[PDB]
Amino acid sequence: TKPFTLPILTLGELSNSRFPVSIDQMYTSPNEIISVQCQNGRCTLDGELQGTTQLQVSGICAFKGEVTAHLHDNDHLYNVTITNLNGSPFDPSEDIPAPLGVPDFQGRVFGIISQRDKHNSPGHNEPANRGHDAVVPTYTAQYTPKLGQIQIGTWQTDDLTVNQPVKFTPVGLNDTEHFNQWVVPRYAGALNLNTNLAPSVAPVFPGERLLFFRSYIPLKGGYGNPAIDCLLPQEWVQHFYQEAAPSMSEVALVRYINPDTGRALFEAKLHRAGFMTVSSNTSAPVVVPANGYFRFDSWVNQFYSLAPM
Amino acid sequence: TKPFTLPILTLGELSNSRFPVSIDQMYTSPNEIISVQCQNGRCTLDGELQGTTQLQVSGICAFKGEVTAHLHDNDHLYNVTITNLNGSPFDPSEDIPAPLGVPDFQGRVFGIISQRDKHNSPGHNEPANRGHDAVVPTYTAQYTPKLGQIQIGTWQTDDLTVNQPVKFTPVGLNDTEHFNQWVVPRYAGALNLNTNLAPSVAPVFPGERLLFFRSYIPLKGGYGNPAIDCLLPQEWVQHFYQEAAPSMSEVALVRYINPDTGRALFEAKLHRAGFMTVSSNTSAPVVVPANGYFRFDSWVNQFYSLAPM
């Protein structure tokens, strides 16, 4: 049986799987956050990608599509018929919640909408281009990527062309209004239940809480320090997908190694579904040396009582 | 911003974009024709060719290919593997509904199939040739140009050579059986939805109807006076493609000018998608002086109430 492994990466070498930025810290879940159900950064230990998870950092919270309408009520709004990230048509009958990569939380995502026209004009051997600041609200009835359509807003009011293809590059949040990182959008609107979701995850043992890989992401304006917590770094998603090592129990015991001594600084349960819990009474950053890294030690079971940290 | 313009052409100088004949009249749409979706003569005001539209009159309802079979069930039938109009292989993965130029309506198209053999015979410094009357039905399961094949019929029964290249020059309809100018063929047959179609067009304002450029095309036999209505003259397609002027709103207000006075005889909405509507309660020819011509006056919006005509 192919042994299960983690890649060998320090905190400074880990990428967030829910927003395309570097990890800032490990962080234990607050008391009020007992269960979560994010859809990016979801992969079982045996290498099954789930939810809206795909392999590339450049796909996380990104999308592609075609501008299909410029709204006159508010000349700052445009409807986009989305595609898959590779540009191919999105088939809503596919067994996924929404096109892979789309945002998996409620918020006002800020980035750039870039448009390169599909054909050249006589006299020009390259296509025309225009790009602009844009906001993508994910908490409204207009965010229906599973129905093939998302609505965006710009600050400019007549420089996206209808029927030309777009790419959205996420940067951060526009503001913290309506930001709830743990509320999954209604990908097909209110008449339809989300389908094919990655399952909820939670500690099942008293005294345990979730261990997150956290990034503090940009904010275009206002006060705030918004956090995006992921269950697995993108590199672990990528590694498990490559390896497809069979899971021998429901819980992999992992230890954070200090390579100067070879000793464990703390231990965690890495559950088969692809998330970790720790025995901790506090919600706070987990301070570790820059050179430390997680290592798989052994398959255990769900009754294992972790050493407090 | 490059200003949008029309060419300066009278009715007698306009070419149909859906059949390779001269325009006979302008004609307002019947009450039963509220929406259409033709695929030739499709071009946005900013110069994006759409559907099966190409630039040359000689391509409209024409095709090229190779005879690949002579049928014995009915010795009057031949299968043709079609190419692009320039003779290059047709790639069915290309983002178009069918090779550019093919007929975009249901009917029995009459023309000449001409065959010039690919190599010379010893003793002859030029290739052998044969041409014959032919009919191309576009409404049957045998019309599958997007799958690379069209079936034709002749009156002669052994004078097209298998494996030699053909050119179809359209002339008119054979008869009016199965003629419906507004039903788009199933370019890839019944198992496949048409792809990459130019969109449907319709008035969106009460009292308005479509304004067509109409030709009465030849009929090989029987009773009839068949009309082909196009949304844009071929010269407007060609001009918009050359100019690629950005569209400043969804509707260009155009006026039909009487040059003897400089005054407008009527006005129309020229929509961004490339079609016109007028405020009219009747469906009939629009009688104008031979010297009149359309002129772009201003960008307006979709709420503009046209003067009745």
Residue B35, burial from CB neighbour count under 10 angstroms (0-12, 13-18, 19+): exposed
Using CA coordinates, name the residue in chain B closest to A122: B242
Q: Which two tokens stand for residue A142?
A: 């207009």
Q: Are B3 and B246 in contact (CB under 8 A)?
A: no
**Secondary structure (H, E, C), B111-149:** EEEEEECCCCCCCCCCCCEEEEEEEEECCCCCCEHHHCE
Judgement on whether residues B118 and B220 belong to the same structural domain of the protein: no
SS3 of residue B237 by DSSP: helix
Residue A16, burial from CB neighbour count under 10 angstroms (0-12, 13-18, 19+): buried
Judgement on whether residues A81 and A47 belong to the same structural domain of the protein: no
Domain end point (choices B146, B174, B202): B174
Judgement on whether residues B48 and B64 belong to the same structural domain of the protein: no
Q: Which residues of A touch B301 (CB under 8 A)?
A: 72
Q: How far apart are CA A149 and CA A187, in angstroms?
A: 10
* B92 DSSP 8-state letter: T
Please name the residue that has the structure tokens 């949040």: A173
User: Across the interface, which of A72, A122, A158 has its CB nearest the CB of B241?
Assistant: A122
Q: Which two tokens stand for residue B74?
A: 């009915």
Q: Which residues of B touch A72 (CB under 8 A)?
A: 301-302
Q: How far apart are CA B118 and CA B164, in angstroms?
A: 6
Q: How far apart are CA A259 and CA A257, in angstroms?
A: 6
Domain end point (choices A174, A206, A224): A174
Q: How far apart are CA A68 and CA A65, in angstroms?
A: 9
| DSSP E strand boundaries for B47-94 | 63-70, 77-83
Q: Which residues of A touch B204 (CB under 8 A)?
A: none
Non-local CB neighbours of B169 within 8 Å, separated by 6+ positions: B62, B111, B112, B114
Which of B193, B72, B83 minimizes the C-alpha distance to A89?
B193
Judgement on whether residues A149 and A52 belong to the same structural domain of the protein: no
User: Across the interface, which of A72, A121, A163 has its CB nearest the CB of B244?
Assistant: A121
Q: How many CA atoms lie within 13 A of B175 on its CB side?
A: 5
Q: Rounded to 10 degrees, what is the CA torsion of A80, A86, A91, A94?
A: -130
Q: How far apart are CA A179 and CA A135, in angstroms?
A: 13
Using CA coordinates, name the residue in chain A closest to B248: A158
Using CA coordinates, name the residue in chain A closest to B247: A161
Q: Are B227 and B181 in contact (CB under 8 A)?
A: yes
Q: Are B222 and B74 in contact (CB under 8 A)?
A: no
A22: containing domain: 1-59+175-309
Non-local CB neighbours of B283 within 8 Å, separated by 6+ positions: B27, B28, B29, B30, B31, B209
At position B198, the amino acid (one-letter code) is: A
Q: Which two tokens stand for residue A62?
A: 């990104």
Which of B68, B262, B77 minimizes the C-alpha distance to B152?
B77
User: Across the interface, which of B47, B248, B302 has its CB nearest the CB of A121?
Assistant: B47
Judgement on whether residues B116 and B216 belong to the same structural domain of the protein: no
Resolution of the solved structure (Å): 1.2
Beta bridge partners of A129: A116
What element of type H or E holds B236? Answer: helix B234-243
Residue A303, burial from CB neighbour count under 10 angstroms (0-12, 13-18, 19+): exposed
Please name the residue that has the structure tokens 């879940």: A29
Using CA coordinates, name the residue in chain B closest to A75: B249
| DSSP E strand boundaries for B128-262 | 129-137, 149-154, 165-180, 208-216, 227-230, 251-258
* Opening angle at CA A189, ends A187 and A193, nearest 5: 75
Judgement on whether residues B126 and B194 belong to the same structural domain of the protein: no
Q: Which residues of A touch B47 (CB under 8 A)?
A: 121
Non-local CB neighbours of B303 within 8 Å, separated by 6+ positions: B205
SS3 of residue B261 by DSSP: coil
Q: How far apart are CA A24 and CA A213, in angstroms?
A: 8
Which of B17, B296, B248, B240 minimizes the C-alpha distance to A121?
B240
At position A189, the amino acid (one-letter code) is: G
CB atoms < 10 A from the CB of B225, how many? 8
| Cross-chain Cβ contact A122/B248 below 8 Å | no
Q: Check which CATH number belongs to the domain holding A307 and give it.
A: 2.40.510.10
Q: Which residues of B touch A116 (CB under 8 A)?
A: none
Judgement on whether residues B32 and B2 belong to the same structural domain of the protein: yes
Cβ-count burial B129-144 (b if 16+ within 10 Å, e if not)? eeeeebbbbbbeebbb
Q: Looking at CA atoms only, how far is residue A7 from chain B in angstroms?
A: 40
Q: How many residues does chain B have?
A: 309
DSSP letter for each residue of B1-39:
-PPP------GGG-B-SSSSSB--EEEEPPTT---B--S
Q: How far apart are CA B110 and CA B106, in angstroms?
A: 13
Q: Are B62 and B170 in contact (CB under 8 A)?
A: yes
Judgement on whether residues B201 and B64 belong to the same structural domain of the protein: no
Judgement on whether residues B196 and B88 belong to the same structural domain of the protein: no
What element of type H or E holds B286? Answer: strand B285-286
Judgement on whether residues A160 and A195 belong to the same structural domain of the protein: no
Question: Which residue out of B1, B46, B49 would a mutagenesis test of the A interface target, given it has the greatest number of A Cβ atoms within 10 Å?
Answer: B46
Q: Are B171 and B228 in contact (CB under 8 A)?
A: no
Q: Which two tokens stand for residue A222?
A: 């206002």
Q: Are A70 and B302 in contact (CB under 8 A)?
A: no
**Considering its fold, how many domains does chain A have in total?**
2
Q: Which two tokens stand for residue B38?
A: 């033709």
Q: How far apart are CA A33 and CA A4, in angstroms?
A: 29
| Cross-chain Cβ contact B48/A119 below 8 Å | yes
Which of A103, A137, A104 minimizes the C-alpha distance to A38?
A104
| Cross-chain Cβ contact A72/B301 below 8 Å | yes
Question: Which residue out of B2, B48, B242 would a mutagenesis test of the A interface target, given it has the greatest number of A Cβ atoms within 10 Å?
Answer: B48
Q: Looking at CA atoms only, how far is residue B241 from chain A in angstroms?
A: 7
What element of type H or E holds B241? Answer: helix B234-243
Interface A-B: count of C-beta contacts within 8 A? 16
* B240 DSSP 8-state letter: H
From the centroid of its chain, how far is CA B97? Answer: 14
Judgement on whether residues B54 and B66 belong to the same structural domain of the protein: no
Beta bridge partners of B83: B64, B89
Q: How far apart are CA B146 and CA B187, in angstroms?
A: 5
Q: How far apart are CA A34 and CA A205, in angstroms?
A: 11
What element of type H or E holds B193? Answer: none
Q: How many angstroms separate the first and last alpha carbons of chain A?
A: 32
In sign, the C-alpha dihedral spanning B178, B181, B184, B187 is positive
CB atoms < 10 A from the CB of A224, how many? 14
Q: Which two tokens stand for residue B127?
A: 């290739």
Question: Which residue out of A118, A163, A164 would a mutagenesis test of the B interface target, given it has the greatest number of B Cβ atoms within 10 Å?
Answer: A163
Q: Check which CATH number belongs to the domain holding B137 and give it.
A: 2.40.30.120
Q: How far apart are CA A48 and CA B241, in angstroms?
A: 49
Q: How far apart are CA B118 and CA B16, in angstroms?
A: 33
DSSP letter for each residue of chain A:
-PPP------GGG-B-SSSSSB--EEEEPPTT---B--SSS-B-TTS-B-TT--S-GGGTT-EEEEEEEE-SSSTTEEEEEEE-TTSPBP-TTSSSSSSTT---SEEEEEEEEEEE-SSPPTT-SS--EEEEEEEEESSSTT-BGGGTEEEEEESSSS-S-TTSEEEEEEEEEEEEEEEETTS---TT-TTS---SPPPPB---STTEEEEEEEEE--BSSSS---EEEESS-HHHHHHHHHH-PPPSSSEEEEEEEETTTTEEEEEEEEETTTEEEEE-S--SEE---TT-EEEEEEEE-TT--PPP-
Which of B184, B196, B181 minimizes the C-alpha distance to B143?
B184
> Solved by what technique?
X-ray
| Cross-chain Cβ contact B242/A122 below 8 Å | yes
Judgement on whether residues B293 and B249 belong to the same structural domain of the protein: yes
Q: Are A118 and A164 in contact (CB under 8 A)?
A: yes
Q: Looking at CA atoms only, how far is residue A126 from chain B in angstroms?
A: 14
From the centroid of its chain, how far is CA B267? Answer: 25
User: Across the interface, which of A72, A122, A163 has its CB nearest the CB of B244?
Assistant: A122
Q: Which two tokens stand for residue A67?
A: 């501008």
| Cross-chain Cβ contact B301/A161 below 8 Å | no
Domain end point (choices B116, B149, B174): B174
Q: How far apart are CA A177 and CA B132, in angstroms?
A: 72
Q: How far apart are CA B97 and CA A47, in angstroms?
A: 40
Non-local CB neighbours of A216 within 8 Å, separated by 6+ positions: A24, A225, A226, A227
Q: Which residues of B touch A119 (CB under 8 A)?
A: 48-49
